[PDB]
Each structure stands twice: as C-alpha cells, then as structure tokens.
C-alpha cells in the first residue's frame, strides 16, 4: 500500500520538522516490538536459525537481529 513506502531516507533534509517526524521516528520499532511480544515462539526459531548458520558469535548476532527485524516487517 501507500503507507508501506514512507518518504524517509530521501535526500531532502532541512531545518524544519518533517511531517510526523516524532511519531514516524519510532513506528517501525514499535511494530517490531509488538509483533515480537505477541509471537514469542518465533524468537526461539530465529535463535535456532542464527545458531546453525553463524560460525562466530558476531555472525550469530547479526543473523538473529536481521531475522528478528525482517519477519514482522514482511508481515
């Protein structure tokens, strides 16, 4: 839909506050947190996938974080 492609990250940055800067700064984080806390089961699956693909701890953490962020956002 239209809301799925916000006008963020574009090259037009000025002094004045953008439209819904304060509200739109944390909406993605809030929705990710709500989905994660409403589907706690997927946390262990993400941990499992990260652990059997990340050879080092840094790779494990990167893959786990990316899986945690992508799945609610693809919802």
């Amino acid at each position: 839909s239209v809301a799925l492609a916000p006008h963020v990250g574009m090259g037009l940055d000025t002094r004045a506050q953008t439209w819904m800067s304060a509200e739109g700064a944390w909406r993605q984080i809030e929705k990710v947190e709500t989905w994660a806390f409403r589907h706690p089961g997927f946390t262990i699956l993400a941990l499992f996938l990260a652990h059997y693909i990340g050879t080092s701890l840094t790779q494990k953490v990167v893959i786990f974080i990316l899986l945690m962020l992508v799945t609610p956002s693809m919802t």
């Binding site: 239209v2 963020v8 990250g9 574009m10 000025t14 004045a16 953008t18 439209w19």
Partner: protein
Amino acid sequence: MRCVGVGNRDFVEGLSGATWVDVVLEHGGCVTTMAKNKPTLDIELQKTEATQLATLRKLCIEGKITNVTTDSRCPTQGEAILPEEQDQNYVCKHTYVDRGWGNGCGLFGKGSLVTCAKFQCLELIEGKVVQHENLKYTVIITVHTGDQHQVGNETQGVTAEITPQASTVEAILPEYGTLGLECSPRTGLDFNEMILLTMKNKAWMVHRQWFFDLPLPWTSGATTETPTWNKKELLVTFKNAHAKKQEVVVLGSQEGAMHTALTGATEIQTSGGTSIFAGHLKCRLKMDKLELKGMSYAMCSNAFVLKKEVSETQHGTILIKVEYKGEDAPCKIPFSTEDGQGKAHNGRLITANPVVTKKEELVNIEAEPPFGESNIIIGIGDKALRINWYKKGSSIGKMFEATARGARRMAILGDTAWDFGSVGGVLNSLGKMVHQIFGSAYTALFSGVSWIMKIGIGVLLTWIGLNSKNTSMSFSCIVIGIITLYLGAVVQA
C-alpha cells in the same frame, strides 16, 4: 528580522577582501554579520514562494464504483470478454469460477469470468511541480540599530526579493547605506527534482521519484473534464469469494495511509498562493556600501539607567536595555567591558554603534561578555552605570558547541555548509571539494536508509573496523561508522 534568542542565529564575523562575506541563509535561524567599522546585521531568509505552479500528475485517494458488469464462459470455451474492457473508465480482472448445469453451463469444470465496473475518484491529491525560475526568495534584513522595540521583533526589517531572473539585489537600508546581495537562487533544494503535492488544503514537498512510485491511480494532470485513470486496480479489490462468483468493492479513502506515507517529508504552506518554508539560500553579502549611523555624533556626557534586567542568550550573548537621561539626544553610548579584577577590554559589542536617538527613547545594546565574571560600564565618568554579569561556561564549552553546530549544519546542508561564513579561502575550497566527492559517494550508498537502519549499519561498520586487521580498512570502517551513527542520530530534522 532581528532575531535574538532564536537559538539558531549563527554568528558570522569577518570579511575576505573587497568587503564581502559568503553566507548561507536557512529558514530556521538567522545569520549575524558584524564586521569591523560596519553596522551589524541579523539577516535571514524569511519565506520562499512559488508564484505559478504547473500540475504534472494527479493521483486520487477516494473512489466510487458503479455500473458493475460480468461475463462468463464455460470451462473449455476460454477467456470471457466484456465489451467494456477497452473502455479506459472501467477497471476489471479475470477470474476462474466453477460452472455446471446449475450455473447454466453444459460442461463441468472451471470457467473464466471477468467483471468490469466503472471507476471515478471523488478526491485527488494533485502533485504539481515548481518551475525553478518562478521562485521568489524573500530575504528580510534588519539593521540591528539598537532600537527600543526590535529585541526579538519579527516585523521590523528590510525586504529584498531574490529570483533567478534578478538575483543580485541591492537592498537599500535606511540611513545605513545599500547592502549588496549577490545570491544564488538556483542551487537551493534542487526544486527540479521535487514535486510539491497538495493533498487537500495541506501540501507537502516530496522528492520527485517517490511521487512517481505511489501505489495510487494517476492521471495526466491536464485539467481535463473527464480524466483517464491509469492503474485503477490499486483501489478496487476483486474478491472471488468461494470461487463461484466475483464481487468488486472499493478499498476506501487512502487519506490516512497517504498521510502516514508522508512521514519524513517536510510540510509546506498552501494558504493563498503557495509559500515554501523550510528552504535554504546562499546569498553572498557584499557590504561595501554599509555606513554607520552615528559615526559623526559626539559622546554622551550623562549617566544611563537600566530599564530591564540583563539576560543571557542561548549563545552566551547578553542584552542590555538602557535609557539615556541627558539633553544631547543625538549621541554615542560609551561602552567598555571591564573584566574581573582587571580593566582588560575582553568583551566586545555586537551592536556596531550603540546610539541614542532621542531623550525619551530606550536603546537595546547587545554585547558578548567574557566567559568569566565581568562588569560592564555603559557611561562616562564615576557616575557611569556599571552592569555586573556572570556568564557561565568555558571557552572549551563554546568550542564543543560550535563544533556540534557545524556538524549539524553540514548534516542538513551538506557540501553547501562549507560555504557558510566562508570568507574567500583556498584551503576551505579544497575542503569543500573533497567533501563534495565524499558526500556524493556516501549519498549514493546510504540513500533511502531509515532512522534506525542507518544507526544499525553504522554500528556494524564500527564493529567491522574494530575487528579488521588491515589498518587502513579498519580506520576507514571506524571513521565512516562514526559519521553514519551521527547522521542516523541527526536525520529527520
């Protein structure tokens, strides 16, 4: 418009040669130019308005649906056709439904089905690009004369119109000579790659290529009586139900979804003729012809009295409100800043020539005091009024504050911020060039990255740098990660 206490006033001091200083004017905040033996000025870009707007494309947000039709075929007989598919007014999709002797078909199986319905948009959004040479940059230039009423007064100043047709404008200040503005209206915000849509009585400034990528049905924007909506399938939704019949309904008013999708896009005024706020201009100040008011007056021989308590601006600058009780009305205000325990003249005026114009009139004297406790004398003789003040903070504090302010200025402005207060300079130009190259390279990489995703990538880059054995690669990754974290923490102003 003589802003003091705006919190973004951005003092600019000095002249390169031939008496001119290059400055960049932004909507939020002023610039304060105080050269030697010139009147000080608190200049800013007041408003930019587009005189005439050309509508380029008009999406629609609401939609009404009428004249629903439907044709069906038996399973093997192929695709169904309505005569109204070729009509651009109607929107429709083919679906497969089951047919049989109960549905009138003689052969069992899944048969094609198409249902075409009329479409018209009740409300529309009306994106309308701005011609880059019909702009009008209105720079308001105060005189910082020390009047009684202008301390933060936003209605007093001199107005100069800056357009690409006539960029260089000499704004005749009253009794202070004619300031020379050599401006650059063509390099501000790149309005060519912006579309400035209007919604309904609420316009916004949007980057060009995003308004072309909105999943809403558009038009040519030709001010035609009957429009031809393209990609009408985005609004109307076709539900096949239980695969036995197809029903079409409108998805509803996209106003809230579009309002959400406009987050991070700077708003804009649309009352009457459009007036673009939230812009920046690169007027270069030529102060050849600026004279002072009272250079020919004498010195005041009588005492002064404080009429309002002194206060400290967010930038450490004090303001003084004195009234001169004496008979020689045209005069000069003696002003010496005595330091603590010593008579060192360490504090300097920000009002070029503090002048009393009338016996009854009050005068506002602006002065930057030293970072320590410092008395201030406003009069002559032993009966001179002496203002005592304790400005808090350290010179390291001002250095850190100025560094952070410049980093922010470079964040919003980019390469243009190198030209703010840039009196000529040859090393400065080389820094601007290298920053241009690196900024273009960075903007190519990090375009379209979010508030949090920029910080995440910056943290990842920093971690990669810390664990990179290659010293050059490690240093590069750490340096780019730190600035990426900064940009992520300052983005979306």
